[model samples]
Target: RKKIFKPEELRQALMPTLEALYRQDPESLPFRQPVDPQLLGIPDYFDIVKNPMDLSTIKRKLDTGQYQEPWQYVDDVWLMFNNAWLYNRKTSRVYKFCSKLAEVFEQEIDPVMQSLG
Candidate 1:
């Protein structure tokens, strides 16, 4: 049901721009010049999640054709970074907290939500 969008919706969306700005790495990318250490240190995953409501980076991505569609592009980027944080923090404090939430969601919240109309 979420596989649709109206016309001109992508121009206003700037997450792809922000993503490209945040992901301006050269070694892993093509065409662009190499990125500095400071830029490299900035975690693209955390940056996006931290500013999920912001479209600063989306403006940068607009210059390039890395992504298409506001919804699909932003959704895909969110999922990508979301998985990155999860995998990287698998055994860290964050994961531990997530485990507690997972337990509650599995045993309590999910069951109740599933029964809702």
Candidate 2:
């Protein structure tokens, strides 16, 4: 069965975590240039998962229309950074931490997404 969460419930549960991340790296989200301070915030992965690409880089790739799904875009970008971390393990603390965080989210959220589907 789906975990039936109202928008307010989801917001209440998730917003503090999101806001904390936004407070750290306000320019990192892939949305509009000037993110509103009050309305929405981003997860830490937006800043923690740093490599050569930023939001503009992803936007350019998305504009190519080659990817049929949003996940494909993420997968490709993630692999690039993963490889970067593999090659620079001693120096790439941000990459390693972000990858670990992503791993945890994937492990924890897969069932949630499946249930909702």
Candidate 3:
């Protein structure tokens, strides 16, 4: 059976997963660098959204009819996580690990999508 998550619950659940994502494959750490949120299309201030990856931000945006689509929030979070690595010059383990992690994460989500369909 699949577990359903409210946004806050999902964010809480992802904390450990995000931690594990680095611990299990510390190789990706070398590529873990600060990325400009603006470069990723995230708002610089709380005017549009308080914080791009925050459930509160998404919820508020949704409640106020601010988003063009709700999934834009999710896509932004994904980009925030990957943007630094995506721009790395070396085609190294960091790239490989993040790439592999993305693949596994996508595969894990695919079943949920399938079930929804």
Choose the strongest candidate by TM-score: 3
Order by TM-score, highest first:
3, 2, 1
**lDDT at 64 for candidate 2?**
48
Report the C-alpha lDDT of model 1 over 1-117, residue by residue, as the tens digit. Answer: 133433344443443343433344331131132223256564564544443322333344444544454444546445434443454466764345434433332343333223221
Full candidate order by lDDT, most accurate first? 3, 2, 1
Cα error, candidate 3, residue 29 (Å): 4.1
Clash numbers, per candidate: 6, 0, 0
Q: 1 or 2: which has the higher lDDT?
A: 2
**lDDT of every model, 2 decimals:** 0.39, 0.41, 0.45
Better of 2 and 3 by lDDT: 3
Give lDDT tens digits, candidate 2, residues 1-117. 233444443333333333332343322232213222234343433354454443334444445444444344446546544543644454555445545544543454444344333
Structural similarity to truth (TM-score) of each candidate: 0.29, 0.35, 0.40
Model with the higher TM-score, candidate 2 or 3: 3
- In candidate 2 the C-alpha lDDT for residue 110 amounts to 45
